[PDB]
Design a protein around this ligand. Structure first.
Ligand SMILES: CCNC(=O)/C=C(C)/C=C/C=C(C)/C=C/C1=C(C)CCCC1(C)C
Length: 173
């Protein structure tokens, strides 16, 4: 299999606090329009109250050919599903995109990898018309082959197999 968003599995008993820290974007499936290009690094935090938030850094290619290092902020609201959040985001720079997107943690082991996903528009059939997904790593060097195998499985389960591209890290930001 099913490609309906509602049938997708998410991370069981997702732990916000164990998820905190630095996450390096290894690969990504882009959505329609503008997006972060490369050199993406995210820092997740959780306050005493259990409110998760994050800050992201990354290179954005302005429609005008400007390359900017974007500094982004996102706040997450919890839902009835511990692994599915509503994320409000904005940039430090007023010209960076602002919005609200679903943010689901598909899978993670907290120590090595993470698979994230967001459907910004649903088709009439329940499938996703415009999505994005990131594969994160704790270590910028990546994962082992064993983890690589888990990640591929998750990508397939999301109906996004073969749609990701490797993201370069050259500390542009
Ligand atoms: C031209 C304006 N520049 C842009 O077009 C800038 C854009 C899109 C930035 C989009 C940024 C987005 C969605 C960031 C989403 C996410 C975060 C906030 C931080 C947590 C994880 C993230 C999932 C990595």
């Amino acid at each position: 299999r099913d490609c309906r968003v509602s049938s997708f599995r998410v991370k069981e008993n997702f732990d916000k606090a164990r998820f905190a820290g630095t996450w390096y974007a290894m690969a990504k499936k882009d959505p329609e329009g503008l997006f972060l290009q490369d050199n993406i690094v995210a820092e997740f935090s959780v306050d005493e109250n259990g409110h998760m938030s994050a800050t992201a850094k990354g290179r954005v290619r302005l429609l005008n050919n400007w390359d900017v290092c974007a500094d982004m902020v996102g706040t997450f609201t919890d839902t009835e599903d511990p692994a599915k959040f509503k994320m409000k985001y904005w940039g430090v720079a007023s010209f960076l995109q602002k919005g609200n997107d679903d943010h689901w943690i598909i899978d993670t082991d907290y120590e090595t990898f993470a698979v994230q996903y967001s459907c910004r528009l649903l088709n009439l059939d329940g499938t996703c018309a415009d999505s994005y997904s990131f594969v994160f790593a704790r270590d910028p060097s990546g994962f082992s082959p064993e983890v690589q195998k888990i990640v591929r499985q998750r990508q397939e389960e999301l109906c996004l197999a073969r749609q990701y591209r490797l993201i370069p890290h050259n500390g542009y930001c």
